[PDB]
Design a protein around this ligand. Structure first.
Ligand code: 3PE
Ligand code: 3PE
Ligand code: PLC
Ligand code: PLC
Ligand code: SF4
Ligand code: SF4
Ligand code: SF4
Lengths: 115, 112, 240, 321, 181, 136, 48, 192, 69, 126
């Protein structure tokens, strides 16, 4: 049994410094494949917008401190990277991923029903 | 305990910022003398103030948008329920079960 | 040349009032229960450092170990001559939110050599790692992938761990007890977007919870004791 | 193989319930267990031959499926999804005349198997598509969790009906075919022998079918008869509670496996003392077989993959349960 | 043994007269059936027109009106209990023996030894300081021989058979037939 | 009448028995085609999952007109046994337009043939070229 | 009688072993027929 | 004493003759090279397979001419649902809600109250035919045989809405199919 | 069952008009003894011909000529 | 020293098990594996280990059978653990297990105790 393309062996990193390098290495791989993501899935946005989106998602977990949470977050990011590069996702999923979009006042929610 | 396990659970953010769960022990039914259901601690979610239930006009079905409306977790101890709720970062509150006061009961008291 | 007989018209036997034995089905396992107790104790004696405890139910033996002891016990149960469990038939998990470690990771081994089956039980949390038995059993590759997909258990050392059942980009682990049975979202075809899109879940008829009708009385008692006499702590002789 | 799927779950619940099926019930699940096995092998082998290019044997055997599915519908009312085998016995007793109709089919089914082998067994084209294709060593078959024909094709004589007998399989005589080369052609030959051995078992079940109840004589698990329900106070209560609350199963867990036509099918059921299972892990032999596809089909050509898929007897409902 | 059977003994529609003689001449295997069920025998009484009068079968010990106390046959509530053996209880069984072969002192002197295994007692320490004959007789079997994994069915044997017995493919085909033995 | 080989789940087994000698769909001119280009009938026989829904839509769009869709079984009609599942589409009509619904779990081989007969009755009532003359 | 049961004597035995007897002449006869046909065929070709 | 001395077992003991014999070489063939070549060149088994296929060409086929002919049916067959009546015309169902509880797919919706005359009757009985798995649990659980499954299968509909049966549709089905249901009941009731 | 002699016997028994209607919907020429008629008008027959196969001893004659339901 | 010993032959007559070939020197290979196994136990594993006690008991029994039976069938019929080709595989795996057991130090105290609530199911402690 040979592992699929871009498959990494799951490993639990016990060093916080080493974990930072692995995230940085994975961060560059996302940026390098940004044009490939545009070509494979036929997106309506340029590769520059994809890299902005990738940076925004990475910055959402910048201030995560717990090392056990980092390993799960890094592992799922590797799985997401493998899914995109190998064209396993359908083009509809990637289109909706970039189709993500001042809140309403109290009265505006009140008049319509709110939640 | 302190770990924010909701960051990796995959559940939507609305479970934390918009929903309230109740940790409670089921009260004894007034129509039955059994107490088996009162031996376990359970967690359920408060209903949505709107959209919890509405009537479908085609067939009279009970339509809903609350995906947690039918979820009831089972726990063996109160501490386990609190630890799980804290682990998932849920907004919760505990309803302390009512305890029955003990009163001596004998057949002689029917005349004395 | 003869015609075939009409099976309908053939005579049939006449039976009076039938009789049948009345015995506990657990009685037929008396040899299996005692033999597994001795074999389960032999494994603990061989591995006191790893075997936390063992249990025997009828013809099923379960070995309970820590996550740090999974590799050693599985290696012993695979290569020892007396216990040649070369086949790992299943790797599964179960969710127990009450405990500090939610998940019980279960390994069912088969020994075609001695016609025996054994079970290995360990525990995991949402973030704690579990050693991967893929190097030992190559058939556990897909089972561990399925366990992660439906539970989220961290299998360290898996050559290629990813989703195997859920849709690409699925959020959540369905077999967790806190995961709603209907999920969070649903799909439909959007005419404007000319494609299938995910939308928040709305049910025309909400799932009705009839499980609240469970009995308010306990149904099964404390059961009967079937422990072999050779595995009960002795009672000391009375006073002189 | 619908009725075998019900049997493994029924056995798991019965073992947890500490109950035993009566003698006639066990024979019925054995009789329809092998009728189910014949149905599965008819779908498995002929579709495997159809994928290779043999279209005609597929049509011949699918009429035999119609005759056997009529037996499914006669005892349950459903051609395919017959919820007949239930924890504690079977849903209903055999209708009168079923055994005669089963036997009349049995006297003829032997010729259908021989005519099937006329086009495949000694064909040079068929052997060039199966001999040496998808070879699996005995060492690797165990390590990948292969079972059934996949395991027995590599020289390992292991069968659950012999390793752990269940439901009157210990009261019938049958043989197991074991391969030597571990390729597709050996597995085809084994599945044809299992065809005749299943027909051998079906004949014995017809002759040795005993009288008696078909479900456990315990109304707290098995529904009472309708006539007794409408006359007896206790029968009505048990009928009411079995259909509204169900029956509670003592707390515990089990791992029950049966020799399914696909291989080893097992269920890991966890009970909490309630009327609903706490966990039900379903072990699919096809799920394990497909996990070894990469290890088996590497180096072969594209048409060999189609043969390897067919020789594993893959149903993706079982795989994706 | 399921040897060849003549065509007229199988419940299928066959040929008659001259057409039967022609079939025997032209068919390679004349004893094979056409597979068409007999219209005059197969399913002639339909399941909805059966004349059998069905009666519910009941056994005497478990389905009678007398001598039929339910708790005598209540196997569901007499299920085996779940018992787990940790290293503390195994050490107690190893040191004090079992109830089948007691090796525990009598009276108050024996209850002191029992109370030792009410807290954590490692099995490795127990094995370190113990008479080796106990291990060879209780933990091990047959004077030190290892405990082999017990079989799920001790009657699961096999024997190699030849074509004249099982009637399957001859010896030149790459499969073999194993009987019950 | 050329359907497309699109068997998903147990409903497909009954679809195979329509091609079996007992019913012999080929006697009515029914041939199953492996490519959407050569097929004008789409028989959704099985459960449609969210992971499968985009593939079903793409295959449907690749069929040249005129094209019809048949929904067979409870899964394709409204989800059936898996209606309240997290990964099951509650009816194939959420993705593609359905011309006829065949009930059953599974629908019998005669139930499917009856549904095909209903569709053929609808097709014989088409007035495509008279619509151009009178309605346009 | 009040159930579905086999006859008192039981059902007659069925055929379940392999029944695929060989048919045709020996291969040498077919080879001779091919050579005889080839010989006679070339004879008529030569005459023409 | 057993095979534990050598760490063996009865199950692990291969039977006599388990080891394969030595494979044959080219000098040990039973058939001559000319005989093996004649079969190989003249396609002996291929013509044998052709002859068997031609035999079926002169046999009766299995095809039945649906819808002019129908396949076999049994009284236990499960098809379209119906609500039945007593011979006096009164509805059999007492709105006991057993079928709603058993239903594995939760395809049954029941609402009930006291009738105008005081009878325990339902005023809303819905079955989602697109949700039902046609499993017969509702028929088994009915204490008055009110809900049954007719042997009918030819009710495919143009629109999915038509597969949402209310009480009026189910009662009409019971009146329409009462005679056929009586056929099945008279032959299957003793076995229940 | 597929013999031409069976078709000729059924053609003679039925007649031209009856057989031609079968040649339009039935795709087969069949004859049988009348069993009865339903409220809709369909006629039902049973076949006594020994050469008919198991599942083809009963059939219906629909009222319509071009379409059957 | 360098005692290079063949465990699994890659060629030769088949044994009836796919991928398992006949061993050219059945008896001599088992003798060296058994004797090396006994020596390795006495140098790595302490005496009080139950694993060491059990392995010596059966390794000597299998060594005595190999050294007293010239016929291959009689060796298998008394050990009862498969063919001799399979016995060589078992001897190699048992030899390697002893080396892993020595590194694990699996005869010491329980390395990790379970929690108090660990093996409890629905309120009942196992
Ligand atoms: C060779 C064996 C001898 C063949 C028979 C010879 C023969 O019959 O020749 C007759 C024919 C007529 O020619 P004619 O001049 O009249 O010969 C005198 C006849 N009294 O002469 C001819 O026309 C020759 C006709 C062909 C002769 C036979 C050819 C056989 C082909 C070789 C077989 C290949 C298969 C191996
Ligand atoms: C369309 C035009 C017609 C086309 C078809 C033409 C048909 C005519 C074909 C002519 C060629 C056929 C040759 C057949 C004779 C030679 C074959 C033979 O006799 O066997 C080879 C033989 C080896 O002996 P062996 O076969 O092994 O016998 C022991 C086996 N138990 O070897 C020998 O001992 C002798 C060596 C062969 C000498 C003859 C050549
Ligand atoms: C005449 C021109 C038309 C036919 C040409 C081809 C005929 C076969 C040639 C090779 C025969 C061979 O090699 O014969 C040998 C084989 C097998 O016999 P075996 O294994 O040696 O038997 C064992 C030894 N016995 C003989 C003592 C028992 O016989 C066959 O399988 C004959 C096939 C007959 C069925 C098909 C015949 C009609 C074909 C379809 C119509 C075109
Ligand atoms: C001198 C007389 C000349 C005779 C002329 C005819 C020769 C025919 C070919 C013979 C050789 C052969 O069929 O060979 C078989 C080849 C190659 O097989 P292989 O890889 O070598 O294995 C076999 C060798 N063994 C056993 C030593 C390992 O593949 C095939 O199965 C080809 C199948 C083609 C079937 C087409 C039939 C169509 C219907 C025809 C009837 C109307
Ligand atoms: S509707 Fe029923 S038969 Fe059809 S695919 Fe779904 S479960 Fe299977
Ligand atoms: S047949 Fe089964 S699934 Fe259908 S309505 Fe009745 S109980 Fe529900
Ligand atoms: S089970 Fe019968 S009586 Fe009870 S609610 Fe359903 S239809 Fe009515």
């Amino acid at each position: 049994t040979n592992p699929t393309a871009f498959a990494q062996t799951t490993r639990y990193v016990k060093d916080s410094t080493e974990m930072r390098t692995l995230v940085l290495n994975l961060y560059r791989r996302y940026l390098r494949h940004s044009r490939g993501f545009v070509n494979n899935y036929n997106l309506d946005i340029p590769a520059s917008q994809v890299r902005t989106k990738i940076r925004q998602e990475f910055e959402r977990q910048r201030f995560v401190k717990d090392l056990p949470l980092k390993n799960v977050l890094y592992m799922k990011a590797q799985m997401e990277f493998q899914e995109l590069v190998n064209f396993w996702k359908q083009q509809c999923h990637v289109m909706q991923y970039f189709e993500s979009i001042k809140g309403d006042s109290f009265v505006q929610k009140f008049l319509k029903g709110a939640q | 305990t302190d770990l924010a396990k909701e960051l990796v659970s995959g559940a939507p953010k609305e479970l934390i910022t918009e929903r309230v769960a109740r940790i409670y022990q089921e009260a004894k039914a007034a129509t039955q003398s059994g107490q088996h259901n009162t031996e376990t601690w359970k967690i359920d979610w408060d209903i949505l103030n709107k959209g919890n239930r509405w009537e479908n006009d085609l067939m009279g079905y009970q339509s809903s948008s609350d995906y947690m409306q039918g979820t009831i977790l089972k726990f063996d101890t109160r501490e386990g329920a609190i630890r799980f709720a804290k682990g998932q970062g849920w907004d919760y509150y505990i309803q302390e079960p009512k305890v029955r006061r003990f009163v001596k009961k004998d057949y002689s008291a029917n005349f004395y | 040349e003869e015609p075939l007989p009409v099976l309908r018209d053939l005579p049939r036997p006449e039976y009076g009032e039938l009789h049948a034995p009345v015995y506990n089905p657990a009685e037929k396992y008396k040899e299996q229960i005692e033999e597994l107790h001795k074999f389960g104790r032999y494994i603990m004696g061989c591995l006191p450092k790893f075997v936390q405890q063992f249990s025997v139910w009828k013809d099923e033996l379960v070995i309970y170990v820590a996550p740090s002891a999974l590799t050693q016990v599985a290696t012993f149960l695979k290569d020892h001559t007396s216990a040649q469990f070369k086949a790992c038939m299943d790797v599964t998990a179960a969710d127990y939110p009450t405990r500090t470690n939610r998940f019980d990771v279960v390994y069912n081994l088969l020994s075609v050599r001695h016609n025996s089956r054994i079970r290995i039980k360990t525990y995991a949390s949402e973030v704690s790692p579990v050693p991967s038995v893929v190097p030992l059993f190559q058939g556990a590759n897909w089972f561990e992938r399925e366990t992660y997909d439906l539970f989220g258990i961290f299998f360290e050392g898996h050559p290629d761990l990813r989703r195997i059942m859920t849709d690409y980009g699925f959020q959540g682990h369905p077999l967790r007890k806190d995961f709603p049975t209907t999920g969070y979202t649903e799909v439909r075809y959007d005419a404007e977007k000319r494609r299938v899109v995910y939308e928040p879940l709305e049910l025309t008829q909400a799932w009705r919870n009839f499980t609240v009708g469970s009995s308010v009385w306990e149904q099964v008692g404390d059961g009967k004791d079937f422990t072999p006499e050779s595995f009960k702590l002795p009672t000391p002789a009375p006073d002189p | 193989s619908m009725m075998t799927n019900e049997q493994v779950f029924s056995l798991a619940v019965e073992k947890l319930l500490n109950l035993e099926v009566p003698e006639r019930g066990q024979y019925i699940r054995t009789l329809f267990g092998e009728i189910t096995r014949v149905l599965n092998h008819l779908m498995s082998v002929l579709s495997h031959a159809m994928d290779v290019g043999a279209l005609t044997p597929f049509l011949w055997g699918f009429e035999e499926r119609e005759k056997l599915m009529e037996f499914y519908e006669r005892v349950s009312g459903a051609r395919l999804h017959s919820a007949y085998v239930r924890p504690g016995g079977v849903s209903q007793d055999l209708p009168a005349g079923l055994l005669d109709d089963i036997y009349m089919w049995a006297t003829q089914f032997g010729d259908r198997l021989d005519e099937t082998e006329e086009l495949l067994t000694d064909s040079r084209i068929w052997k060039q598509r199966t001999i040496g294709i998808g070879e699996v060593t005995a060492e690797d078959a165990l390590n990948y969790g292969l079972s059934g024909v996949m395991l027995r094709g590599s020289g390992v004589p292991f069968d659950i009906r012999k390793s752990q007998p269940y439901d009157a399989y210990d009261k019938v005589d049958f043989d197991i075919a074991v391969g030597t080369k571990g390729d597709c052609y050996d597995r085809y030959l084994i599945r044809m022998t299992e065809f005749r051995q299943s027909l051998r078992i079906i004949e014995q079940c017809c002759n040795q079918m005993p009288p008696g109840p078909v479900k456990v004589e315990d109304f707290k698990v098995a529904p009472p008869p309708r006539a007794l329900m409408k006359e007896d106070m206790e029968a009505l209560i048990h009928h009411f509670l079995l259909y509204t609350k169900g029956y509670a199963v003592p707390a515990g867990e089990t791992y029950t496996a049966i020799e399914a036509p696909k291989g080893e099918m097992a269920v890991y059921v966890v009970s909490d003392g309630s009327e609903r299972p706490y966990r039900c892990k379903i072990r699919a032999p096809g799920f394990a077989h497909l996990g070894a596809f990469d290890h088996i089909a590497r180096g072969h050509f594209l048409p060999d993959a189609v043969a390897i898929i067919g020789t594993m007897d893959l149903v993706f409902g079982e795989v994706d349960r | 043994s399921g040897g060849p059977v003549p065509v007229f003994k199988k419940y299928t529609t066959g040929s008659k007269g001259i057409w039967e003689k022609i079939r025997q001449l032209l068919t390679l295997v004349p004893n094979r059936s056409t597979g068409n069920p007999l219209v005059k025998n197969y399913r002639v009484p339909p399941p909805g027109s059966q004349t059998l009068k069905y009666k519910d079968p009941v056994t005497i010990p478990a389905g009678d009106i007398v001598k039929n106390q339910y708790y005598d046959r209540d196997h569901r509530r007499n299920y085996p209990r779940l018992v787990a053996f940790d290293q503390t209880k195994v050490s107690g069984l190893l040191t004090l023996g079992s109830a089948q072969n007691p090796r525990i002192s009598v009276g108050e002197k024996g209850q002191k030894e029992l109370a030792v295994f009410d807290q954590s007692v490692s099995l490795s320490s127990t094995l370190a300081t113990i008479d080796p004959k106990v291990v060879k007789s209780e933990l091990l079997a047959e004077g030190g021989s290892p405990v082999v994994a017990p079989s799920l069915n001790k009657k699961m044997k096999f024997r190699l058979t030849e074509e004249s017995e099982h009637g399957m493919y001859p010896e030149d085909y790459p499969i073999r037939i194993f009987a019950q033995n | 009448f050329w359907p497309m080989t699109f068997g998903l789940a147990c409903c497909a087994v009954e679809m195979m028995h329509v091609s079996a000698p007992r019913y012999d769909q080929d006697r009515l001119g029914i041939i199953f085609r492996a490519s959407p280009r050569q097929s004008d009938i789409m028989i959704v026989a099985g459960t449609v999952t969210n992971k499968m829904a985009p593939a079903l839509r793409q295959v449907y769009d690749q069929m040249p007109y005129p094209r019809w869709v048949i929904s067979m079984g409870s899964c394709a009609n409204g989800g059936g046994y898996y209606h309240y599942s997290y990964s099951v589409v509650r009816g194939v009509d959420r993705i593609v337009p359905v011309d006829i619904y065949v009930p059953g779990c599974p629908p019998t081989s005669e139930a499917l043939m009856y549904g095909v007969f209903q569709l053929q009755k609808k097709m014989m009532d088409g007035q495509t070229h008279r619509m151009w003359y009178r309605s346009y | 009688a009040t159930q579905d049961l086999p006859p008192i004597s039981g059902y007659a035995p069925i055929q379940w072993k392999r029944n695929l007897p060989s048919r045709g002449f020996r291969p040498v006869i077919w080879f001779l027929g091919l050579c005889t046909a080839t010989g006679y065929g070339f004879y008529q070709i030569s005459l023409a | 004493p057993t095979l534990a001395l050598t760490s063996g077992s009865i199950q692990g003991t291969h039977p006599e003759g388990f080891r394969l014999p030595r494979p044959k070489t080219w000098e040990e063939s039973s058939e001559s090279a000319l005989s093996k070549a004649t079969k190989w060149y003249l396609l002996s088994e291929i013509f044998r397979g052709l002859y068997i296929t031609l035999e079926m060409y002169f046999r009766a086929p299995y095809t039945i001419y649906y819808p002019f002919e129908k396949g076999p049916v049994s009284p236990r067959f499960r098809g379209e649902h119906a609500l039945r009546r007593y011979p006096s015309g009164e509805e059999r169902c007492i709105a006991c809600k057993l079928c709603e509880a058993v239903c594995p797919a939760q395809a049954i919706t029941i609402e009930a109250e006291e009738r105008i005359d005081g009878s325990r009757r339902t005023y809303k009985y819905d079955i989602d035919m697109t949700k039902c798995i046609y499993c017969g649990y509702c028929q088994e659980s009915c204490p008055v045989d009110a809900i049954v499954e007719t042997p009918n299968v030819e009710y495919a509909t143009e629109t999915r809405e038509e597969l949402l049966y209310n009480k009026e549709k189910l009662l009409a089905n019971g009146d329409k199919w009462e005679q056929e249901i009586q056929y099945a009941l008279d032959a299957d009731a003793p076995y229940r | 069952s597929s013999s031409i002699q069976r078709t000729l016997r059924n053609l003679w028994k039925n007649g031209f008009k009856k057989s031609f209607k079968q040649l339009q919907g039935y795709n087969d020429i069949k004859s049988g003894r009348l069993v009865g008629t339903d409220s809709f008008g369909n006629k039902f027959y049973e076949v006594d011909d020994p050469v008919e196969i198991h599942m083809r001893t009963r059939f219906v004659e629909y009222t319509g000529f071009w379409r059957q339901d | 020293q360098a005692q290079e010993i063949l465990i699994k032959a890659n060629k030769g007559n088949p044994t009836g098990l796919t991928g398992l070939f006949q061993h050219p020197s059945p008896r001599p290979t088992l003798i060296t594996l058994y004797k090396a196994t006994l020596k390795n136990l006495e140098e790595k594993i302490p005496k009080e280990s139950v694993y060491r006690t059990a392995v010596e008991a059966f390794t000597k029994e299998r060594l005595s059978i190999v050294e007293n039976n010239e016929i291959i069938e009689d060796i298998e019929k008394k050990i009862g653990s498969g063919l001799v080709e399979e016995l060589i595989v078992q001897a190699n795996e048992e030899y390697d297990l002893i080396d892993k057991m020595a590194e694990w130090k699996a005869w010491e105290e329980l390395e990790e105790k379970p929690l108090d609530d660990q093996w409890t199911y629905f309120g009942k402690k196992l």
